[PDB]
Amino acid sequence: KNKCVNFNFNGLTGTGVLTESNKKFLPFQQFGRDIADTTDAVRDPQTL
Amino acid sequence: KNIDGYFKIYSKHTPINLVRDLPQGFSALEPLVDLPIGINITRFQTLLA
């Protein structure tokens, strides 16, 4: 966390700062997005 | 609804004080399940206790 790194979250490729989310979410949500349709967050498949 | 076999079911439960046919206000139905079945449906029915 808090580091620029590559990642593959069950196919959710990308690169950026992973840190804890202080934002709400649905029970069935798998990730979030911004106005730019860019992956803004993600749920880990092993620790939701 | 059944989209490409994925039979989707949204739902919600809330208290009300309805004194009419249907209520006012606003509330959206969250998803519940998702079933890739893949059949042809043209009519349905309801059950009662």
Q: What is the resolution of this structure in A?
A: 3.1
Q: In what order do the strands lie in the sheet with B2-3?
A: B2-3, B6-11, B30-36
Contacts of B31 in chain A (CB under 8 A): 28
**How many CB atoms are located within 10 Å of the residue A16 CB?**
13
Q: Which two tokens stand for residue A39?
A: 């992956």
Residue B10's closest chain A neighbor by CA?
A28
Classify A16 in phi/psi space as left (phi over 0), alpha (psi -120 to 50) or beta: left
Q: Does B30 touch chain A (CB under 8 A)?
A: yes
Nearest partner of B11 among B37, B41, B34, judged by Cα: B34
Experimental technique for the deposited model: cryo-EM
* Cα–Cα distance, B6 to B36 (Å, whole number): 4
**Neighbouring residues of A30: CB distance < 8 A, sequence distance ≥ 6:** A42, A43
Q: Does B4 touch chain A (CB under 8 A)?
A: no
